[PDB]
Design a protein around this nucleic acid. Structure first.
Lengths: 687, 247, 148, 182
RNA sequence: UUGAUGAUUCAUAAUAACUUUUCGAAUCGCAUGGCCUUGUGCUGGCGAUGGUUCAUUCAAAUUUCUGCCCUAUCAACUUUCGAUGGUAGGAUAGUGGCCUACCAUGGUUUCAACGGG
RNA sequence: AUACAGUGAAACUGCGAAAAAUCAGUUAUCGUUUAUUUGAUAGUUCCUUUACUACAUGGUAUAACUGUGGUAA
């Protein structure tokens, strides 16, 4: 199977110049002592374009005998320029190949024409963008790289002039023109010596403010060798790049050098990095170097990294530093450096945000420094750890109560001195942090409930209730006072932590008829609270709790059919709970098998057990409903950015920047602590 | 797949297997067309075998009168152009003195258009006058002085008409089909029966008053100033015996 | 496409009135035909003023090639049928202002007119007739006397 | 007698093995889809509605009156009762493939036509041993950016063709005007 | 003030309806461009399939007439169960007894109809 | 690549498997089909539409598959 019919983009992405790796091409090194006559009389016999044959009819007396080439230098170049800028698509391989062999044959006398040739072929490459045929700029970039391969001996000073001529091919806002120009310039970088290279890169760093991606492609193809190794110019190209960096450059220069280090470390990655990292560390010993350190440590040497980080931390003490410490803790394999780095980051600031980023990256170990960070001295990190995963909460349970207990008693005293929307928000900001701090807090929470007698403040009272037989009497008092899912979780915590039945019982069938809202999680928590309350004060209720807690779709359809069959074969509390959970299954609106099974089993039992009222309630729930919980103030953001545009380092920087924006400031932290939201008020347009 | 008795002005080799190519449906008839297999395989010899002809057809190198027509058995018959983009070539295929399909190498400025005899002028739909031609290009809105058995000059970028040669007594003519093939000249007599068998008689350098069927003739232009070039001395068929007597 | 055989035929459509049914039949080369079977309605048109209307056909009272088709009430081409006369009477009253030719004004108050089938609903798919008027009306009144 | 009975609500089937030749007498003279009682045919289940469809004798053949060679009898469950038989009503089988059309997945997840679904697709999981592979089927008949671009191009194609045609008609009108004038 | 044909009731347009209904794109691969009302906003190319009607093409279908052995101890054949024509219809992609009704009683032939190998 | 993306079993689909007696020609199809190829070909589908609407595009009904068997092949 051949003749694949690649697309234009397929041809270009599979295309790459590398004229040394253009393997054989023995069409011109078999020189008949003139070399232009060799390529010319080969192309006159293989290709017959109309204007190429007219070009040969204009030129043919003036091609043979290399002294008669060198005498008639102007007319042949003016004819070649006229026909190239004529640019039929069919006559572009012979003209560009003749230009390449023409520069090969002249050499040092080509320099008078060198600044016309490049801009004429640049107009040709823009015309090839319009032409849409990959062969055209295949030939064009091959002839350009041949011009570089034959004039690299004399393009020593004028690298800045050839980049001034090759700006509209590095930066064109087309993607592939950048890479195709950049690897030819990269071959020209694998050339002219180190002092000219460093002054060239110091003169080209001014063009940063698609030039960044173009220079990234140029430096990457320069340092990169053939296969699974780095080139011989890498151990000096990294030195020239790092010495043109370090505060004698622009702003995005560290980001471009970091992207170059990431691309080279992704490409070579086996043994040639052992020759690059030595010169890189020896040049980076002289001192933002944290961006280079994060680039060196992100891509998965540890002793030298530890020594350099120790020198960096000492020079800093005598953000991006938190990101570098997070990456070192996530990537290193050294126990002594890690145990020293814990105390170093403790001496550093924003330890709560660093612990949040480190737990998000890799929850490794060492939760015993956040206790000292809290004793030195909050809300949102402990809130996210409390609402975090299973092992995350099991590790945050250690330093939940092990915080600054003086500050916890201070928060308890400031909560006992009650003030009582914004005051409830201040009470919630105290309550979520002081929840991990008995009867005194319970009576103060009852006083706060009586004083507040919005739904977020109800959930804050629920958070204090989850923080809590005196507690049973306090829960009876809150029952006398009786989001809602957090309230049902608080009721489950209260029933997990007689005369109360003689006081209350009403509430059982009320919670049963309330367990039909637009949240299966709220239905599960309400059924849990009803089961615990009916226990402390049943078979179909526990079966419905099990069946409400594609194979899951068929099993849930059969299970809801079985529970409806049992309720059809068989108290008023059980009847109301079965009808409300059946309405919850018919308005779950997230599994069509269950939403068919409930509506197919409901028309067998008795009607008018609040059935027409529940159906009218479902048909009238789409009338008018919205939400507006609370608000806060505003602050600033958008800092700690060591990179912009690369591989997955950009995604990791976006994740750490979003975490720092969540835990960023006072007003941002208040809004993000308010942003912890309850179950949804949803499921419209199908009920 | 019925073959081995082809139209014998194709001149295929007889020790070339058994069969012979079947021209598909197209703008011309069966035994007065010439498919691109017979063209590119045994008429100018650019490809050896028929699947290599299929390769050069599939690779978009050949276009008959404007567009590509990637097809082996495509009956590109008389008077059209074949603009081979590579080799800079414009094959117009015209007739010869003997009965074969002679080739040209047309300039681009003449290959930009083609011509052809009409077959009828009609009113198609919604009261729209449209003409046809011999190669099926039923084109709309002519000049309504177009008569039957007349030639229009198709623009071949669009399908418009640039000019037409309103034939009458005395404007330069071509012939096609019949045993008086490849002759020019239009001025002796103009016969018109009722049911065919009639010609505008011919006058040449030797003034040979010749006739054929009126279906077997169509026009080119003015006397001495033709719209198409003609191959090998603007074919006359004087005599081969007189040619070997003189030269 | 289009072979030949020696000698056979097919079963006719020989349509009736009442319970209109249309059965499509396969035609080689386009124009898929329709046999009307027992069709009860038809398109009937005035010749002079030129107005059609779909009208419930009452019955064929004359056939010029088989008398038994009038007995079986067969709707072929070129028969003599009665229909309703009321929408043509409605257009006549509406746009002439007469509110009623002589030998059709005498048929109006009788109630049902005479018309001629021109389609072939045994093969075509529909039934049309035009109301006879003029010398056709003269010879078909003579054909009514040939009936009686 | 082998009985392959299918419970289509749970999509399962099982073969029972039945005695009772005077219930084979009941199975005789039954049309395709007649009332057959579950407790009356079976001492192992109670009170259903069974409708026959067809049966295979020896060599497996497809009037409606069955014969005595009918070893295999196919039954479907119409009206379930309560009994949890371990072969018909207990065994839950999964749906092999989920929905593929856009409005079909909108009906299957109840999705409120402003959603732009593109995330509720039913994944399936494989792993060669070290590298995981999750696979999402496709969503055809879905409003991608391509289809309305194609509809836009169709509409503009029809309008542009009509524009060029009604330009050429006016050009022929001026040509007939000048042919009148000469 | 009108197209062509040797020739039209041709081509076509309008008129008044009937449409068990026709078609008038719910499709596909590649690039992703220009704009500014930065919205998943407006537009945009190359060409694969499908469809209305006309022309051409091939393919099929009948139908015209010129043309083949030995024969009159082979001269009558055919209308039955249409054999030969008309008229209307059924039919049929279609003309046409190809069939159905009513009317007429024909047709072929000695120059070898019809039959014999 | 959290709709899929190049690879492809199987299956659905699309297309194609069509002894004046024979004939060799000749004439017409203004007495039929015109599939395939080629060239032109079409703004009109809701407006008893503001208690304003499927078109940023709506519905089934199944193969391959999964499962139960027969069977002597």
């Amino acid at each position: 199977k051949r003749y694949r019919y690649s697309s234009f983009k397929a041809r270009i992405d599979d295309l790459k110049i590398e004229p040394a790796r253009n393997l054989e091409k023995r069409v011109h090194d078999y020189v008949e002592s003139s070399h232009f006559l060799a390529s010319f009389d080969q192309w006159k016999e293989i290709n017959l374009s109309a204007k190429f044959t007219e070009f040969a009819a204009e030129i043919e007396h003036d091609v043979q005998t290399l002294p008669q080439i060198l005498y008639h230098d102007k007319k042949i170049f003016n004819s070649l320029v006229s026909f190239i800028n004529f640019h039929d698509e069919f006559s572009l391989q012979p003209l560009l190949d003749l230009l390449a062999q023409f520069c090969h044959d002249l050499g040092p006398d080509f320099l008078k024409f060198y600044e016309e040739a490049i801009k004429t072929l640049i107009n040709l490459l823009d015309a090839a963008i319009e032409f849409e045929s990959s062969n055209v700029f295949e030939w064009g970039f091959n002839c350009l790289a041949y011009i570089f391969k034959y004039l690299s001996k004399f393009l020593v000073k004028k690298l800045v002039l050839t980049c001034d001529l090759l700006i509209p091919l590095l930066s064109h806002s087309k993607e592939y023109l950048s890479r195709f120009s950049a690897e030819a310039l990269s071959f020209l970088v694998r050339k002219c010596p180190v002092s000219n290279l460093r002054e060239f890169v110091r003169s080209v760093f001014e063009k940063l403010e698609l030039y960044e991606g173009l220079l990234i492609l140029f430096t990457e193809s320069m340092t990169s060798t053939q296969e699974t190794l780095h080139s011989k110019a890498k151990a000096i190209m990294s030195v020239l790049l790092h010495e043109a960096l370090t505060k004698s450059s622009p702003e995005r220069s560290v980001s471009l050098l970091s992207d170059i280090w990431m691309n080279i470390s992704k490409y070579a990655s086996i043994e040639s990095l052992l020759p690059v990292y030595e010169v890189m560390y020896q040049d980076f010993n002289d001192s933002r170097i944290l961006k280079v350190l994060t680039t060196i440590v992100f891509s998965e040497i540890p002793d030298w990294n530890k020594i350099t980080i120790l020198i960096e931390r000492i020079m800093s003490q005598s953000l991006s530093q938190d990101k570098v410490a997070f990456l070192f803790a996530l990537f290193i394999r050294n126990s002594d450096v890690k145990t020293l780095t814990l105390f170093h980051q403790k001496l550093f600031n924003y330890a709560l945000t660093n612990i949040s980023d480190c737990f998000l990256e890799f929850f490794q170990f060492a939760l015993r420094l956040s206790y000292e960070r809290v004793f030195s001295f909050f809300l949102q990190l402990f809130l996210k750890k409390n609402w975090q995963s299973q092992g995350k909460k099991i590790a945050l349970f250690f330093l939940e109560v092990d915080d600054k207990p003086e500050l916890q008693k201070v928060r308890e005293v400031n909560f006992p001195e009650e003030f009582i929307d914004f005051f409830v928000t201040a009470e919630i900001n105290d309550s979520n942090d002081l929840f991990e701090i008995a009867i005194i807090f319970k009576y103060s929470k009852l006083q706060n409930t009586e004083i507040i007698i919005e739904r977020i403040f109800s959930t804050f009272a629920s958070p204090d209730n989850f923080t809590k037989g005196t507690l049973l009497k306090i829960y009876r008092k809150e029952d006398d006072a009786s989001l809602k899912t957090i309230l049902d979780n608080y009721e489950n915590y209260k029933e997990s932590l007689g005369w109360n039945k003689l006081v209350s019982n009403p509430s059982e069938s009320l919670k049963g008829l309330m367990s039909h809202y637009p949240s299966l999680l709220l239905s599960l928590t309400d059924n849990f609270m009803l089961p615990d309350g009916k226990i402390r004060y049943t078979l179909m209720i526990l079966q419905g709790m099990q069946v409400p807690d594609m194979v899951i779709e068929e099993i849930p359809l059969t299970l809801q059919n079985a529970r409806d069959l049992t309720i059809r074969i068989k108290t008023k509390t059980d009847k109301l709970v079965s009808s409300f959970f059946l309405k919850y299954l018919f308005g779950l609106l997230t599994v069509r098998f269950s939403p068919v099974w409930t509506g197919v089993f409901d028309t067998l039992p008795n009607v008018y057990t609040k059935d027409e009222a529940l159906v009218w309630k479902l048909v009238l729930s789409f009338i008018k409903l919205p939400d507006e919980n609370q608000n806060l103030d505003y602050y600033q953001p958008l800092l700690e950015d060591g990179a912009n545009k690369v591989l997955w380092d950009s995604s990791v920087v976006r994740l750490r920047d979003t975490i720092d924006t969540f835990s960023h400031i006072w007003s941002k932290y208040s809004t993000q602590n308010t942003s912890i939201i309850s179950t949804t008020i949803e499921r419209r347009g199908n009920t | 797949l019925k073959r081995l008795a082809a139209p014998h002005h194709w001149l295929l080799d007889k020790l070339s297997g058994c069969y012979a190519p079947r021209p598909s449906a197209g703008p011309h008839k069966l035994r007065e067309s010439l498919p691109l297999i017979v063209f590119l395989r045994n008429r100018l010899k650019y490809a050896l075998n028929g699947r290599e002809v299929k390769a050069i057809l599939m690779q978009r190198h050949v276009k008959v009168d404007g567009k590509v027509r990637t097809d082996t058995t495509y009956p590109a018959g008389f008077m059209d152009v074949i603009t081979l983009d590579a080799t800079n070539e414009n094959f117009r295929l015209v007739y010869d003195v003997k009965g074969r399909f002679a080739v040209h190498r047309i300039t681009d400025e003449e290959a930009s258009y083609k011509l052809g005899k009409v077959k009828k002028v009609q009113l198609g739909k919604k009261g729209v006058p449209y003409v046809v031609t011999h190669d099926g290009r039923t084109i709309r809105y002519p000049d309504p002085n177009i008569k039957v058995n007349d030639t229009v000059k198709i623009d071949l970028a669009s399908g418009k008409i640039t000019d037409f040669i309103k034939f009458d007594a005395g404007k330069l003519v071509y012939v096609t089909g019949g045993r008086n093939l490849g002759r020019i000249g239009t001025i002796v007599h103009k016969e018109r029966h009722d049911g065919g068998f009639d010609l505008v008689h011919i006058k040449d350098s030797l003034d040979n008053t010749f006739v054929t069927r009126l279906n077997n003739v169509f026009v080119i232009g003015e006397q001495g100033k033709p719209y198409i070039s003609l191959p090998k001395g603007k074919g006359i068929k004087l005599s081969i015996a007189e040619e070997r007597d003189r030269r | 496409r289009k072979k030949r055989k020696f000698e056979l035929g097919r079963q006719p459509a020989n349509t009736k009135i009442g319970a209109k049914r249309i059965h499509s039949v396969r035609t080689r080369g386009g124009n898929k035909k329709y046999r009307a079977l027992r069709i009860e309605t038809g398109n009937f048109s005035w010749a002079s003023e030129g107005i059609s209307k779909k009208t419930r056909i009452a019955g064929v009272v004359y056939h010029p090639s088989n008398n038994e088709l009038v007995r079986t009430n067969t709707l072929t081409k070129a028969a003599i049928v009665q229909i309703d006369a009321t929408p043509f009477r409605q257009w006549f009253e509406a746009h002439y202002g007469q509110t009623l030719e002589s030998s059709v004004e005498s048929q109006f108050s009788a109630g049902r007119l005479y018309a001629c089938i021109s389609s072939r609903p045994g093969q075509s798919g529909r039934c049309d007739g035009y109301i006879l008027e003029g010398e056709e009306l003269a010879f078909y009144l003579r054909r009514l006397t040939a009936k009686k | 007698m082998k009985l392959n009975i299918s419970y289509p609500v749970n999509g399962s089937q099982k073969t029972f093995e039945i005695d009772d030749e005077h219930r084979i007498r009941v199975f005789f003279d039954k049309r395709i889809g007649q009332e057959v009682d579950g407790e009356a045919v079976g001492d192992e289940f109670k009170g259903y509605v069974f409708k026959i469809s067809g049966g295979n004798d020896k060599q497996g053949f497809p009037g409606a009156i069955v014969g005595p060679d009918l070893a295999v009898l196919a039954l479907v469950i119409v009206k379930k009762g309560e009994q949890e038989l371990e072969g018909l009503t207990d065994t839950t089988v999964p749906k092999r493939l989920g929905p593929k059309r856009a409005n079909n997945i909108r009906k299957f997840f109840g999705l409120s036509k402003e959603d732009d679904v593109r995330d509720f697709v039913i994944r399936r999981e494989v792993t060669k041993g070290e590298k995981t592979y999750t696979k999402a089927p496709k969503i055809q008949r879905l409003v991608t950016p391509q289809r309305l671009q194609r509809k836009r191009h169709q509409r503009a194609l029809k309008v542009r063709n009509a524009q060029a045609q009604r330009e050429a008609a006016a050009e022929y009108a001026q040509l007939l005007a000048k042919r009148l004038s000469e």
